[PDB]
Design a protein around this nucleic acid. Sequence first.
DNA 1: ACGTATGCTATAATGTGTGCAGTCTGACGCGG
DNA 2: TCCGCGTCAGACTCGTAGGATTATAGCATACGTG
Lengths: 1340, 277, 50, 251
Amino acid sequence: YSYTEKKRIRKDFGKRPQVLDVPYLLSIQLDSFQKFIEQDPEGQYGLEAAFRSVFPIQSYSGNSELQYVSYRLGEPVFDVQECQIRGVTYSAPLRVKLRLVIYEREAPEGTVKDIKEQEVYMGEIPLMTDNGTFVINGTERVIVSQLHRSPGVFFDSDKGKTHSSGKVLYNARIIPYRGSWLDFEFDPKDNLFVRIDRRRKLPATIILRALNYTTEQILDLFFEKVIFEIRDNKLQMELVPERLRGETASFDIEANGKVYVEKGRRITARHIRQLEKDDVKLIEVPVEYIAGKVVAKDYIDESTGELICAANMELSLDLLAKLSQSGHKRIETLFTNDLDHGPYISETLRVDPTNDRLSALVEIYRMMRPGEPPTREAAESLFENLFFSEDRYDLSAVGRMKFNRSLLREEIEGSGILSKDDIIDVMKKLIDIRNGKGEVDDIDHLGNRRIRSVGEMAENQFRVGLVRVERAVKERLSLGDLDTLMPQDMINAKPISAAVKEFFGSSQLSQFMDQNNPLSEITHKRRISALGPGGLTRERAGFEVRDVHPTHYGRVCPIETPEGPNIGLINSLSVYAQTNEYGFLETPYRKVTDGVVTDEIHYLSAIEEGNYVIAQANSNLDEEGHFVEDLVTCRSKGESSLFSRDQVDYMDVSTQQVVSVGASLIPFLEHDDANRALMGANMQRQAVPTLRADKPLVGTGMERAVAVDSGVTAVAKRGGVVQYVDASRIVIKVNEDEMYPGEAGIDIYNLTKYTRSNQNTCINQMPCVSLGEPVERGDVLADGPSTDLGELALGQNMRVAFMPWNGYNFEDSILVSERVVQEDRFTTIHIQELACVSRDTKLGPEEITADIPNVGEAALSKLDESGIVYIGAEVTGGDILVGKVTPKGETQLTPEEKLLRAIFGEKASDVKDSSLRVPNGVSGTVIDVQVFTRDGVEKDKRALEIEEMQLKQAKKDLSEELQILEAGLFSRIRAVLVAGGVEAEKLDKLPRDRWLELGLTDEEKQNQLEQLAEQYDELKHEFEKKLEAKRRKITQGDDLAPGVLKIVKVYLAVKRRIQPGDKMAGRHGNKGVISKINPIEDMPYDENGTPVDIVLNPLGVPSRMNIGQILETHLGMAAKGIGDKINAMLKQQQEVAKLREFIQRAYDLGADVRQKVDLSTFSDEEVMRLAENLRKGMPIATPVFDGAKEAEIKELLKLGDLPTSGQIRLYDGRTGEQFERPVTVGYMYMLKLNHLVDDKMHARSTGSYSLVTQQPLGGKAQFGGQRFGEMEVWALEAYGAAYTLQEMLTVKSDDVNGRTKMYKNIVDGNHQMEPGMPESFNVLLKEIRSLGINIELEDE
Amino acid sequence: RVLDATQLYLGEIGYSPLLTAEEEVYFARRALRGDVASRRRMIESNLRLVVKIARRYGNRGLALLDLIEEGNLGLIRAVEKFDPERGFRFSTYATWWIRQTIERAIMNQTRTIRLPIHIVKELNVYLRTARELSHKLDHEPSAEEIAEQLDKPVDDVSRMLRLNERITSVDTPLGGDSEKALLDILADEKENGPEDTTQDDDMKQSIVKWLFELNAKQREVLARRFGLLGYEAATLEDVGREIGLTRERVRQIQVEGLRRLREILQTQGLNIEALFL
Amino acid sequence: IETPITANFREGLNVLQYFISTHGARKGLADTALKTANSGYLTRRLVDVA
Amino acid sequence: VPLDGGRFATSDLNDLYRRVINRNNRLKRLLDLAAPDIIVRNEKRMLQEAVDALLDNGRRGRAITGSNKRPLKSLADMIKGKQGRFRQNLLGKRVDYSGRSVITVGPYLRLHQCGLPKKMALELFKPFIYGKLELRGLATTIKAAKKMVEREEAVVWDILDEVIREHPVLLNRAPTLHRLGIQAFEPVLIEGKAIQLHPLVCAAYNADFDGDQMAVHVPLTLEAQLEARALMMSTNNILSPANGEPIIVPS
DNA sequence: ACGTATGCTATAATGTGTGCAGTCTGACGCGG
DNA sequence: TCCGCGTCAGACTCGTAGGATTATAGCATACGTG
Ligand SMILES: Nc1ccn([C@@H]2O[C@H](COP(=O)(O)OP(=O)(O)OP(=O)(O)O)[C@@H](O)[C@H]2O)c(=O)n1
Ligand SMILES: [Mg+2]
Ligand SMILES: [Mg+2]
């Protein structure tokens, strides 16, 4: 165990030892984008792929061409720190080397004529952070991984297109990565059709003719052969015994010597073995049997030379006699069977109105380009271009892989283009399924739903940049002069830059990171969607997609999805789930070797899961051996039953792999309905971090994993002692073993201090380590906004009691103590950012001065001369943050204003007012202000005071860097010098600037002194250019929108307290509005006196079926009971040995506790720092399904000297008399949701008005009245209340006469109806007249 | 058959003369002297060349059908003014016209807010200068960075970049969710709500009461100067047209009316209360 | 589902018992969102005639 | 109209109009030139494409897509269906004297009562404060009354409190299924941003205090005050109209 | 004079295509 | 007159959130108002 763990240990009730440790939760996002930038040498991936794919590009003539050489990423112009603040993309320069090669025309290919070569920029690509975010225009945004139909082949069947026929019509469909679609489909008459791009329906033999296949070859490919010999006079026929199988003997079947079956008799398996063992090959048959049979190949009369009967023609008696006397006593026919080998291509050819190859390419061309007269080349070029050109078509690796294994092929990896073989093979398996063998694939299987992360999508969007450049290259090359024109003159950098920023902005997958909570960040990065482009739609979405599929097991979470119309499509990834190298998902599984459950793990694909039988994690291992029980509950083939020991092949690794991150944090999930579990995990993401991070007493263990991997905390890169602790930063000295011998070895971690979130909340990093503390590698040094000693802290736990209270907990309504409000524990932080813009209007430029017309000295008190509020100035709604003034035009001073400005005076400067003032209602503390100015017009004085600090603070901060880096660098040299020339004080006489002057003997350590000496100089010279970059970027003027001159961004610090209307919940979906903050006098309390914090309604439990909250309560109480005992011993100031015995007795209680923590290993000092954190309550871990049971909880309650029941004797605070009977009391870890009432409440009397509808606007954002829709209207129609409605149609909405007239009447007191007729109808009249329709209002 | 306006026209040009060198001269020679039939032919014949010239001038302002129409107008002006006697071909001379007429018609019908050629022509060179810079600076060029390479004014570059700003549609959905457009948010500048309408009505009714509370010769001079009761807003000197006919006594009486009215606002409860306003 | 849920909320579901519970839970909540429009559209249809 | 950000914005009609006028004027030009009929044909086909696209864009063929690869909104579209004038900007309206907020329980209230925040009812009854103020002679004018309210001075609360007494307010919850989806009460001012609703009528709204919001509406006219007290009052609405059975029943 | 608008250039070049393709139950409206 | 398949019509009601394009030569007389 580690030091940071020694400070506070979580009691783990797990009994299934973790063979696989929880992975980095942000694996997908980081590894995905890593592939995109990764310049692979050959195995093209990301950009390298994009270039080799499109390039080399050659002119339309083909005399000149552009060739890709190599590319590179320059370091970012502005780093994350800067980018987040300024407000422009955190992107890297793309420099690609191009080569313009030109050939000789009359000569063959003079490739060596002018090999021009240079490097060219095109577009700046947003980079990804270490958190898996993209900084777009100063916003850390997340690109959600997409879930789409995997390319290759797919067999489906509309179980009843025409329920008229009710025929299951089977269809096949080749889905490429790029290219046209290729579908084959049957019809009521079982005629095979082909519909390229699902366009026209064409007979399916027309595509085969296009691949040069004669009528004969076609038949010879699908159908078998039936041989007919006409010997002397008796007509004879070859019989494979296994053919007249499950059919009826239409004729008398007799052989060399025996009659087997009679006319009109079923030929059974007995009769088939009877014939097959007799080794029957030939049988004499009647001539009436051929009438109906289809002739296979063509048969020309040897004599004349004319076709007696063409291929694929139903024979007759007279045609057969015409063939017998022609001179053919060997006829080949089709093996037609209505049951097994079906005759489809046969009946299809009879519909097929085409003839040869060239004519088949015509109707294919007449489908897709109808109206253009076809030529030999246009018809051939089209068809060859569709599925047979390296340009148009690309199945890709996954496409060909799924395509091949769908056809049970030989190859995993093959060609991007469809070969003739592929097409016919597909038609073949479609016909196999139609016959009976072969099963259709289903889309809901994750083996067909591929995952596409950002890096692959960034690659795709980067291709369109290259495709849009391809156009401009070719056209400029051909007609443009060859020599003069340079390659960068033909390249454009905007089409690539615009096409990539299109993705990093407008796309549905690129959305603002939900970062109001570490859990929100990590679960939103692990979100996977089926929506946006190349996916599905709420309009298009069905049910079976949404439905949980047994493939989800271990791959996707069953209980993680919005309850909104985007319900089944959006889904989080499972805990231990990972992406298949091709695209599909895969889940860890413990291999079973010869019964022995081996610790070797194999990530089984969605495909191979179905193959092996998989035991559950419920199954018991024999401590290195096998399953203890002979029978094991297992699952396979998407079904579940008991199996024997040898039959088990694999097993679930952990018991948490079914669920996601969102769900792995819910304790006692096992005792919760999936409907409430979903809502609980959905609200846990909405949990605004509190003022003081409070650890959860009733956790799962996953707590630390989330907080750490979220990238919100600061964890140690190298272990050692914290040389310096500070609120702003942390300095740690590295140990000798880990420290590199070259550099000094002193890590710097400047902690992110209080600043804004995307949801307008607090972000802080407080040091969770003491000055001069020994820290191990990979330990949490600073905690985040919702984390505590590295563990996740989303909300706060408190003593809760389930019972009604005078209906203040009616429908899940919450009754919270004032004592919670007194501790300010659920009081939240909201850093709000407001801005002031100086624009350039037609009348003139605006500026920022304290000089504002029509103002009180009271308003300009908090401002300085420049016109910006001081840092630390408290502000309230109405007070002005930043003084702004714009030009006043030709302004018509109305007579009543010209006289009023002439009486009291103050002839306001021909300059309008528009100062940024605190929005009506908000009030907090200004923590900082940032000024952005165009590189030009002279600055404000406050803008100079801020430049003063940035500079002199950066000069100090860099001075501190080179100083401590110097001390750590000479600290090494001092130790090196002792080794050899041992002299202590005599060496430390003169100063340290003359230490590189001293050396050592010819030794490795003399080379070391030279490394550190010239590296000290390397830092000494580096320090100047580090200062240059800081100084310039502070002097640099910031590029703004056109019209804008300068901006001033203010940061406030609003601290909202909990109040009635605030929404809080547990993590079991138990929602609720705070109805009343009860007085401490009125709160119920136990015999001992301590009151309850929240009083919840017991009726929000049975109907909900989320008993996990009650177990959270019981354990929380037990856990606290133990903290209350430890709190008492630490207050009593007892002993180290007494605490050791009790705490050892606490950690060791569970049946088979996973963690067996001995305290004999802990030193006295390490025990007391532990107990001091255990006194608030012993933090407990209840794994998701391997959690604690009643036996363990009730045993813990006996250790806490708490009741076995969990119900306590409560007394009413109002009165003092006891309640009639006990109530459950305990500590439930509840949360404060983002839905706070200050951000909800709204009211309106009269305000803005809409632009054309002329009814009010919408929302408190724009100050708009509530909408009264038609449903709201019918309500008043039902009542009969006619004016109440007419009032809400006219005066309250449009009626321009009415609204103002009614206002004046109300202030008069005469609330009188004065209608006219809403504007929005007057609009509808003219709008119908604009459509050329006479709509006039016909009068009385 | 064919019901695409595109393919129909493209079919009818596919059955139109393809002229030789001496053919062009024969028709063109008669076309200048007005053969009527000749002018129709050379045009009909070279519609095919207009389409190949509009295949590179697309996706810039109008549609492909819109470019062919305005491209045809260039071929007509080329036929109105060709020189057959010159040994140089027609296809060469007509290309100069068809490329011009298209570019010009795109420069007008591309932008909603009409931009004449002068402001546009210049803007292009500023943008094409941004290309050179962007490739070698690897940084999208600023208004200054463009001004330093051309050695031209800063405001000009900025003024030309202010006319390159695009315009979003009012009916455009908001955030991958066609819930509300911009019209459902954008307020009406003109009419402020009854509160602001009744402010002026009540304020100006209170003034009608304050003018009847003053002297008869103090409201007759004060009102008719500001144009409150009178018809035209006159000045101290111009009040003499009515009956005053004074310059000193008009200025003493104007201010005497305002001084007694300042005490009427101190007593009713405004003065410094209504000074902030 | 042929195989129902044997356990209750006190004793606690195993890993599958919950996986099984999901299938019925998601489909029951899918018909809360999607099926509501047909019933609410009926209200609209009824009203206009009446 | 121009945006605050120096940008402009235009409706798609203007764009569709420019397509019609351009092609129509180009036809006038080609009829001046006596151009060959093959060209005149295209111009007439174009002109019709533009006119048909102006009346109803997405109908005859592909709807003319514009800047953001989306189709231009035509005329017919503003009269068509949900998003048309009828359903969206006529039968349904956003309404003045209207406010909404998280609701919470009101177990102390009687049936004919509901908690209404002060700062809510303040803004809601703004013209009724200015009215009662001129009567008492505390405001001489209305901009004077405006500032008196803004400063939130003590004696203004007592006037607001005066007008609200014996004055019903409409409380709506979404969705409005049956008539009882709106009921009227006598507002009781409470200091807090939460509305407090009567437990027994929670059934009619189906209002669960788990984060529900209810719209408030003030009946302005005296007839609306009588209508609200007579028809839409909670006490006058007990039994469901569907079944002759009480919906006002404890739970 | 200032801004907008109209005009001309002479190698040869002469027929476009581009891009989303698990919605669904119910109801007519033109041929076949 | 009846069957098949083409187009065309709906799919509940209120609340919140935030952003960005490419390019049209180049120069010399013709048309409109202080
Ligand atoms: N998509 C939604 C969600 C909620 N509602 C409204 O909100 C009410 C309450 O929803 P909810 O609180 O989720 O349901 P309850 O029946 O209260 O159940 P629970 O015990 O889970 O709170 C619904 O009846 C309905 O009026 C709705 O109309 N549409
Ligand atoms: Mg609710
Ligand atoms: Mg509820």
